[PDB]
Structure formats: C-alpha cells, structure tokens
Amino acid sequence: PSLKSNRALPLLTFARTHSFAIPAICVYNLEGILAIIRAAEHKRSPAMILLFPWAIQYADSLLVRTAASACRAASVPITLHLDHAQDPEIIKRAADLSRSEPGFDSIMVDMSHFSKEENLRLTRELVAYCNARGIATEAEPGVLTTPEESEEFVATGINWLAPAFGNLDYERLQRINEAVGERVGLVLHGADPFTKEIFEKCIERGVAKVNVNRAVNNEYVKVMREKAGSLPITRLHEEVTNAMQAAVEKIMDMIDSTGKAEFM
Amino acid sequence: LKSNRALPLLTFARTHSFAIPAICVYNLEGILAIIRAAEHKRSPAMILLFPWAIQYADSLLVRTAASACRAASVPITLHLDHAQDPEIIKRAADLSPGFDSIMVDMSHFSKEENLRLTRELVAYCNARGIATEAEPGRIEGGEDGVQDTVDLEGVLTTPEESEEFVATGINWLAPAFGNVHGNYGPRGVQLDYERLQRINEAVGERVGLVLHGADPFTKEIFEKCIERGVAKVNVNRAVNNEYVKVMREKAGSLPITRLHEEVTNAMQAAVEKIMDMIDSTGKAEFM
Ligand SMILES: [Zn+2]
Ligand SMILES: [Zn+2]
C-alpha cells in the first residue's frame, strides 16, 4: 500500500506471469548505466540497474541519482536496485535518498551474514524502514535454502527472495517455489556463468529476476586491459560501453526478456 | 546573467590575483576528482565538458556534473569547452540545471565569420542565463575531444581583434599568444607575454582572460600569465593522463572498484597541484 506506486514490483510480477526473467545488471560506473539503457531500449526489454553499497561509499548520492533519472527517462521499464546491502546504516541512508529526486526502487536487505535469528529480526526492521519510504525489498535466507526457511523470510515482509540451491538443485528450487512463489518473487544470484538451458529451467521453476555482474563488467575490464594507453579516453569510453551493451543484449535473449517491454 | 553562477568566480579571481582551475573531464571519476580536490584545498573550480560528453551520453554527464557542482561546499560551476559548432551550442544552451558557461569557439572560421557567429551565439546563450567565452584568434593543435587545426594557420590575438570581440557581449576571452593545444614539441613553451599584457591593458577591465594549452606549464609560467590578467586556467592532459597511466598499468590486476578509486585519487592529486600553482588553494574561504 505504501508500495502501491512502486515501479519495481510490476517488473517481477509481469515476468513471472509471462515466463521470462528480468535482467538485473550490476554496474560500477556511468558506462555500465548507458550500456544497460541502450541494450534495454534496443531489445525492447525491461531491466534493472543494480548498484552496490560501494557506489554510495565512493560517490555519495551521485551514481544513485544519475542511474535513477536515467532509468526514469528510459523508453522501456527500467528500475534501480541496491544489491547486497549488508549494513543497516547504509540501507537506511540509501532509503533516505527517496525523501528527496528519485532514489532506489528496491533494496536487497542482505542480513545473510548474521546469525539466522538476528538476520530475521534485522530484515523485518529494515524492510519496514524501506517500505515507509516506498521502497521494495529483496532478502537472502542465508548451508542451502529450505522451503521452511523461505516461509520465515516471507513473514519479514520482503517482496522478493534470493534462494540458495547450488548457484544446481532444481528439485530444491521448485519446492521453494511451490511453498512461497505465490507470496514472493524469486531472485537468482551467481548467474554470471549460466547458459540458456539453466536459465530456462530456473525460470520454469519460479525465477523472475536474474542478477549479473562479471559477465557484463568483465567486458569493461577486457577493453581497458587491451586498449588503455593505445586508444584515446573518449574512445575507451565508447568501446567499454559497446562491449558491455553487447553482453547485456545476450543475457536479454538468453532469459527471454527481449521484446517483452512492448507488452509492459 | 545577473544570477549567473560562473561570472563571480573570474571577477573574484582577477581582483585577488589568482586563477580558477578549469579542469576538462570525460567521466565521473574526473568529476569526483575535481569536487574532492576543490573541497580538500578550499578552492573554487570549474568542471569542463567537451561536446563529446553530449554526443556520447546525451544529458547524463551534463546532469551528473551540474548536480555535483550544486552539492559542493566550495564554488564550482560547469563549462562547455571548445564548442565549435553553432548547432551543438544551441543544443547545450537549451539544456537550461545545465551549463553555467559555454565556450563559443568559432576560431576555426575566418575572423569575420568567427565574430558573426560569436555575436549571435552569445545572444542565444545570454537569453538562457548562460555566460560565454570566445577566442579572438586561432590556437593551433588538437586534443581528445578538440578538433585538429590541420590546414589552418595560427592566428595570434591583437588588442584590436580583442576589442572587436568585446562588442559581441562575450564575458571571457581566450587569447592566442603562443600557447598551443597538445604537445609543444622540441621548441618548448614560447609565450608572448608582451602581447598578453597589451591584450590585458586594452580589454582586461571589461572581460576575463582565459588560458588555454596550459598542461605542461610550470608555476612560474602561471604566475607570469596571472599577473597579465589570466583569471581562468584550462587543464586537460595534466589531469587525464593520470587516468590513462593507472588504467594502463592496473586494469586486469585490481577489482573494478579499486580501479575507479585509484584513477580518481591520481586525478585528484594532479588537480590539487594545479590549484597550488595557480594560487586558488584556500581562496574559497573568502568566496
Ligand atoms: Zn549476488
Ligand atoms: Zn583549450
């Protein structure tokens, strides 16, 4: 209800009902933001741009605000997610950007590194903090994720859940899905090396959001390793962005997000 | 223009014998390097973007930089450097939080065409709250983001051409007085300081003077220029070569996060040295 106008939620619910997954791309820079936005507009695909707490450590609100207004100006649904936020203070600080100027649409409240009772308790409290500001939330039931553990995390108020199942244990996956896939969206982590077939089986069994980092960002690293000092700076920027954009477009085709924005 | 944010900086710098560091950047690392350097050293600054920044990222770098400027605890404004195409100038000027100032650089055209286009483009910018810089001559050379002058001759600035440009309503002038964009080569830096003072004497009280091609300059050269009216010093390679060196040596060897940190630190250190050299260090206290 405080989430009634949240832009991030329709993406996963739509993906789940239309048997595809949203590409959720971790980026560290403006070149990454551009690559995602170009890929998505070009493949008529929805997307998410994901930032780590480091983006705020490093640039205060600047990467956040820029990514936010870039996705909102986009011609396909693109929203902004804080990935793997493991400190309560940085979650609240990120969430505070929404009491302006757009900030995050969703935050992964990742308390998985805490003891499970303290994980549960913190998650609940930070989720309530983000929801008060209009912000959707994802959590990790972090030893693998049982269907029982998943239901405990549903109770905290998360919107999406990031199960541990070898990422592979597909039997474990659909059991999680049958138990909780009606109350929360499912999020796949460690997707960087996966193939179409793995993505297909993950999607059939509930995945509506696929996190990617190295598969895209390694393209940025390859160009700089190979071309820095040899290409002018402007050209390096163009080349890293093209390389990253191409990598995002592949993922969009692998997870059937290509074309889907037409119907959203 | 009464409410223009860039104008006071050069005014203040001129009356207090220093220059504003005007640092060209291509990326968020450079934007962060400038804000940090400027806040650390308590110095005003300007962030310079090339037309390439709009060509490449539409309004993204412009918006990121303009916003960083506003949020800074020292005076920092945003300048379009070397805009050499009337169409791009209007496109940039239509953006306005966009640019506080724009360089209407028509120096590639004949003198009379340069004056003609500069006059009308200044009108267009002024209508939109935007201060302007023009080049009453032709500096030779190219940089990444700044076109070559191949097949064009150098044109040194006279007081008379300077006077002609003051009537266009520009705020700042970039004189050609022996400075060169890019590498000076074996002949070294050979500036005509006499020409410069002659310019300053003729128009200095009516317009601010802007130093281009300053990358390899020393403190003593800076001091000579500032004593002759230079209130804005443009820098590029001095700063962005640090990004290149760090990437050249370390990409593939450090996490991307540390890569971004290291280029920004290295660029920040290069900016800080300029600030000291041109005596802008500490000046934000009285602004
Ligand atoms: Zn992850
Ligand atoms: Zn220049």
Dist. CA B243–CA A207, nearest whole Å: 40
A75 touches chain B (CB under 8 A): no
Instruction: Please report, for residues B13, B234, B276, the alpha-carbon distance to residue B269 in angstroms, rounded to integers and kept in the order given.
Output: 22, 16, 11
**B187: number of Cβ within 10 Å:** 7
For tokens 């050609």, name the residue: B176
| Positions of B marked active-site | 81
Ligand 1 centroid to residue A167 C-alpha, Å? 10
B57 touches chain A (CB under 8 A): yes
Three-state SS for B83-139 is ECCHHHHHHHHHCCCCCCEEEECCCCCCHHHHHHHHHHHHHHHHCCCCEEEECCCEC
**Closest ligand (CA of A83):** 1
**Mind telling me how many Å the CA of A55 is from chain B's nearest CA?**
9
Q: How far apart are CA A21 and CA A212, in angstroms?
A: 12
Whole-number Å distance between alpha carbons of B22 and B37: 12
A169 classed as catalytic: no
Would you call B152 an interface residue with chain A, using a CB distance cutoff of 8 Å?
no
Q: Give the SS3 label for residue B28.
A: helix
If you search the block for the tokens 């929203």, which residue do you land on? Answer: A79
- Which residue among B32, B247, B256 sits closest to A59, beta carbon to beta carbon? B32
Spell out the alpha helix ranges (H) of chain B: 7-15, 28-40, 51-57, 60-71, 86-94, 111-126, 159-166, 193-203, 219-227, 237-250, 256-277
* Cβ atoms within 10 Å of A134's Cβ, excluding its own: 19
Least CA distance to B63: which residue of chain A? A66
CB-defined contacts A:B, below 8 A: 79
Distance CA B36, CA B73 (A): 10
Can you tell me the distance from the alpha carbon of B210 to that of B19, in angstroms, rounded to the nearest whole number? Answer: 9
Partner residue facing A28 (CB), from B57, B145, B256: B256
Q: At what angle do helices A62-73 and A30-42 cross, to 10 degrees?
A: 10
Q: What are phi and psi of A35, to 5 degrees?
A: -60, -50
Number of domains forming the structure of chain B: 1
Q: How far is CA A138 from the centre of its chain?
A: 9
Q: Residue A176 belongs to a domain with what CATH number?
A: 3.20.20.70
Instruction: Select from B28, B55, B76, B237 the residue whose CB has the most chain A CBs within 10 Å, as the one to mutate to test that interface.
Output: B28
Give the whole-angstrom CA distance, residue B225 versus residue A249: 52
| DSSP symbols for A1-69 | -TTTT-SSHHHHHHHHHTT--EEEEE-SSHHHHHHHHHHHHHTT--EEEEE-HHHHHHHTTHHHHHHHH
Three-state DSSP at A84 gives strand
Closest residue in chain A to residue B59, using alpha carbons only: A70
Long-range contacts from B215-218, C-beta under 8 angstroms, 24+ separation: B216/B184, B216/B189, B217/B189, B217/B277, B218/B277
Residues in CB range of B127: below 8 A, 6 or more apart: none
Resolution, given in Å to one decimal, reads 2.2
Distance A211 CA to ligand 1 centre (A): 6
Question: Rounded CA gap, B142 and B183, in Å?
Answer: 9
Residue B251 near chain A (CB below 8 Å): yes
Q: Residue A126's domain spans which residues?
A: 1-264
Of A84, A83, A113, A107, nearest to A95 by C-alpha is A107
Of B27, B68, B251, the CB nearest to A237: B27
Q: Which residues of A73-108 are buried (b: 16+ CB within 10 A; e: fewer)?
A: ebebbbbbbbbbbbeeebbbebbebbeeebbbbbbb
Q: Which two structure tokens, joined as six digits, stand for B159?
A: 């007081």
Tokens 């997000």 correspond to: A257
What's the token pair of residue A39? 């890929």
**Structure tokens, B245:** 């060196």
In whole angstroms, give the CA distance from residue B45 to residue B18.
12
How many CB atoms within 10 Å of residue B267? 28
Q: Looking at the complex, does the CB of residue B260 fall below 8 Å from at least one CB of chain A?
A: yes
- What torsion, rounded to 10 degrees, do the Cα atoms B176, B122, B275, B37 define? -140
In angstroms, rounded to a whole number, what is the distance separating the alpha carbons of residues A123 and A152? 11
Residue A28 and residue B257: Cβ atoms within 8 Å? yes
Q: Distance between CA B239 and CA A37 in Å, rounded? A: 29
Determination approach: X-ray
Residues annotated within a binding site of B for Zn(2+): 82, 105, 135, 181, 212
Using the Cβ of B60 and the Cβ atoms of chain A, whether some distance falls under 8 Å is answered with yes
Distance from the Cα of B276 to chain A's closest Cα (Å) equals 25
Distance CA B9, CA A250 (A): 49
For B251, the closest of A28, A224, A235 (CB atoms) is: A224
Query: Is B271 within 8 Å of B34 (Cβ atoms)?
Result: yes
Q: CB count, 10 Å around CB of B20? A: 30
